[PDB]
């Protein structure tokens, strides 16, 4: 999965 | 509210203790109590709220994905019928996840967003609104899926518009907002080109503004820039 | 019981799903429901029950230790008074921990132990009884601390006596029982020499019986033997 | 802490 913050 | 009898300061203290103990459900409950006191949140307090719910919903999303994968495999050809249990339990987790999202969205609507006038606070809360609509979108399959997606998009767009007007391109909230909106485009809106363009333009405009920063601000901004780069690498 | 309407087989299926999703509170609730159906548990089912509650209480113990350490530091000389919040929140976690222990002990007493006639089942449940009294002992400070410690000791001792009569020295339940009883001696009973003697004698008697085992049984026994060695290394 | 199972 892609990075989120 | 079960936290109605506890002092605001005590709720914040206990949220910090819960974080140290990795008790994120407790942390979230304490922060919900603090919000429901009705006063605006400071920067530190906003970040306690976000950390708490991020960790709670993150766990639920991870569990949901495990169960959804098992469910999808059960519905392939050649798969032996195992009854309704996988669907039931995925639904249970899903319903709990939706409940947490609804709770956060409720806090934002009653009345965090409307009282947030500074760009730093308003953008922070609008990013949260987009994020929790995005989590709802991840599990949505019905009459309202399009409206949930549009709610996420609208919240992110308002946050983007404010952030571009009111914050430097290296501001960590502005960067994190862009990072997440880019993921929204890629994973939810079926718009990978928009995702990639956003991540690239955000990275490049941040790069150009790093020279203005102290060492400590530089550290924060470059961390998020690296996440933008990681996504770009994943996607290209 | 909230699980009263769900089929036993469905509860077991859902416990396995919860394990895959790392949803250990759910796993424990499903297994409590399965126990409350009133039938004996198979080997696999006993291990689902233990895995579930081990993970739940393990998290609570870890949190308790974090909070107790903060509390102990607050009560040193030179420490600024921060009010009752650290104690309150440690107490909250403690009370939840005790509740989980009481729940497990209740399942064992109503009626898992009394219906367990085979050595494999009876030793397994008595080990659990010792373990959950040990967790109660970890947090006990009152009139009953000695009685809690004695309850742990008694359960472990009965398990040891059966295991020595009825199981080979390499049986993984017998080994795990000894490992944990040794830790009881070291950490709870203030008997480090007993802890060390038990771990050593257990290791050595297992070593001598490895030759009887298949490759797969050998793997299981040697894993636990290594834990005995690790503790001995920690303690000497 | 010491190992238990
Ligand atoms: C991960 C990192 C570097 O950045 C972000 C960026 C955006 C979000 Cl929503 C969360 C984390 C981070 O933890 N921090 C610590 C908290 C800081 C909060 N700052 C503000 O509210 C006003 Cl600038 C951001 C950076
Ligand atoms: C860790 C390891 C190798 O051993 C133990 C030993 C004791 C306990 Cl209480 C738990 C785990 C392990 O997971 N397994 C898998 C489960 C097996 C269950 N066996 C029985 O009930 C009858 Cl022999 C033991 C080994
Ligand atoms: Mg007050
Ligand atoms: Mg649903
Ligand atoms: Mg653009
Ligand atoms: Mg039935
Ligand atoms: Mg107490
Ligand atoms: Mg002896």
Residue numbers in the entry:
A (entry chain B), D (entry chain B): 591 to 595
B (entry chain A), C (entry chain A): -4 to 231
Text from the published report:
In this work, we focus on the hub protein 14-3-3, a highly abundant adaptor and scaffolding protein that binds to hundreds of phosphorylated and mostly intrinsically disordered protein domains. 14-3-3 is a dimeric hub protein that binds to its clients via their phospho-serine or phospho-threonine sites and upon binding creates order in these disordered client regions. 14-3-3 binds at the extreme C-terminus of ERα via recognition of its penultimate threonine phosphorylation (Thr594), thereby suppressing the transcriptional activity of ERα and concomitant breast cancer cell proliferation. In this work, we report the structure-guided chemical optimization of this nonselective disulfide hit fragment 1 toward small-molecule covalent stabilizers that preferentially bind the 14-3-3σ/ERα complex over 14-3-3σ/C-RAF.
The 1C-linker showed similar binding to 14-3-3σ/ERα and 14-3-3σ/C-RAF by both MS and FA (FA EC50 = 19 ± 1 μM for ERα, EC50 = 16 ± 4 μM for C-RAF). Crystal structures were solved for three chloroacetamide analogues (linkers n = 1, 2, 3) in complex with 14-3-3σ/ERα and compared with the binding mode of the original tethering hit fragment 1. It is noteworthy that although the tethering hit was crystallized using a soaking method, for the electrophilic analogues, cocrystallization was more successful in obtaining high-resolution structures, which confirmed covalent binding to Cys38. Compound 27 (1C-linker) bound in a similar mode as the tethering hit, with the gem-dimethyl substituent positioned 4.4 Å from the methyl group of Val595 of ERα. Differences were observed, as expected, in the orientation of the amide bond close to the warhead, since the amide bonds in the two analogues were reversed. An alluring structural observation was that the aniline group of 84 was directed “outward” of the binding groove (similar to the ether functionality of 29, with a linker length of n = 3, as observed previously), whereas the ether of 27 was positioned in the “back”. For both compounds, despite the conformational switch, a halogen bond was formed between p-Cl and Lys122 at 3.5 Å, similar to the halogen bond observed in the original fragment. For further SAR optimization, the 1C-chloroacetamide warhead was selected since it showed consistency in the MS and FA assays, a similar conformation as the disulfide hit, and a clear cooperative effect for PPI stabilization.
